[PDB]
Design a protein around this ligand. Sequence first.
Ligand SMILES: CCCCOC(=O)c1ccccc1C(=O)OCc1ccccc1
Ligand SMILES: CCCCOC(=O)c1ccccc1C(=O)OCc1ccccc1
Lengths: 9, 9, 236, 235
Amino acid sequence: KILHRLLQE
Amino acid sequence: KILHRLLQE
Amino acid sequence: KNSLALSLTADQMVSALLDAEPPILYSEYDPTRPFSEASMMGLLTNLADRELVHMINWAKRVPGFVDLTLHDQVHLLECAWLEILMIGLVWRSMEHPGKLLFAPNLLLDRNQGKCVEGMVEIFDMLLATSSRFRMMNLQGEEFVCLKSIILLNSGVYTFLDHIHRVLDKITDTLIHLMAKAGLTLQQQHQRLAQLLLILSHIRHMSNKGMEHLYSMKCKNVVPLSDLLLEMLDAHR
Amino acid sequence: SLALSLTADQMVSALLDAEPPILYSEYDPTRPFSEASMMGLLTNLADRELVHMINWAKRVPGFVDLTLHDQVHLLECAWLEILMIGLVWRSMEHPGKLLFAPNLLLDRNQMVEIFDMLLATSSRFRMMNLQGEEFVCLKSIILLNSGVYTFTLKSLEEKDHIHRVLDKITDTLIHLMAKAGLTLQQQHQRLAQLLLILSHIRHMSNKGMEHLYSMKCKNVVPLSDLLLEMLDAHR
Ligand SMILES: CCCCOC(=O)c1ccccc1C(=O)OCc1ccccc1
Ligand SMILES: CCCCOC(=O)c1ccccc1C(=O)OCc1ccccc1
């Protein structure tokens, strides 16, 4: 998920 | 509308 | 021109709301537990149809409601009806963890929601709400205040002062009940917030349930009453 | 959790400091727009605001205390509500108009039902004279509250922390109203007035999510990959 990744960054 | 009528009853 | 509603004391408001309460209705007296889309949706739409009639006559007894024009009464009921059925359902179900008490002779768990396509999701949300109310120890007096708030609030922006003053009057009434129950000032405003936030969730469930009733209408699973169809059609 | 130890003024400061920016749209008054390409302007803008929202959420006290799974879920449920309240807040000083961007101020004539609801909400903010300190509290409440009832005993601990932070934000709202010199009765009335707004915002969001779905199906308005995934989350 894009949101998943952005939240980790 | 039926509601119209029932509100009047 | 001036509404009697605003001149009511907190105790008078509470007694007026308690006395306006509709009765708990029964479903059909069949022993079989609904495990098909058709039978379950038939029982639920039949129940909703009957409860709707009672809801209409309950609404007229909510202080300040009959002081609105008929058109405004129609709009508020059209916008709020499913939220109101749902909060009633959730309230009824509170003392039955894991179950939805549609009627005293119709208590359903999520395993029967698994049946009707696209229903278990709404079923689960309703259960979570019921559980939340139970853990907060929601009182009947608080319940009726919340229900009247839904009636007056849901379609109020889509109008869109009298309703706003009445809404303020109901807020005063909720606080009154909480003080009367012995809560501190901090507990009072915290509890008021907690209850009102749940109204957002109830709105969400109503929106989802409306979608579901629509697909149900289009799939022609079961015939719907003209009343139920018109209440649905209002949400276009 | 440092969140639970903040004072009300510290909460307000943290929230205020964390405010995302207002962005520009690619609108050009000299360029012709169809209903579809005008919608393309708005979805493009929403996409960019989303990126900023995700980073704002990390700065909301308590939010990162949650598992990544739970953070994902809250944002998936609340994103459009958050965009909308931001939009309404911005448009408050522009009767009859929505300010999507400093270079894009629209009236209802220039989806119309949703536009009207948003206008009604802005009108409501004006009626109430909503304060910026109140606005940032409301926005954080949406983030934490909208998805909290749609999530083992381990997963129940997560909900408890959210309810605790929510209570703290209420305390902050009351603090703000008390300092503004409102009576106790007026504090409770206003708190209620503000939270009921959240019901209408949830309503507009549900309505928008369905019109976003039909925009996808018609395939005429360009939608970003992030918007498509967000849309997918709502099934
Ligand atoms: C979505 C069908 C609506 C039918 O209304 C009811 O089943 C109903 C009847 C009596 C009391 C409450 C309800 C109710 O809340 O229905 C909610 C509901 C609707 C569809 C799927 C799950 C729950
Ligand atoms: C953009 C996806 C949501 C569908 O659009 C609407 O529901 C909508 C309709 C009419 C006016 C505004 C909106 C809307 O979503 O406003 C939210 C918004 C906030 C910031 C930037 C763009 C849109």
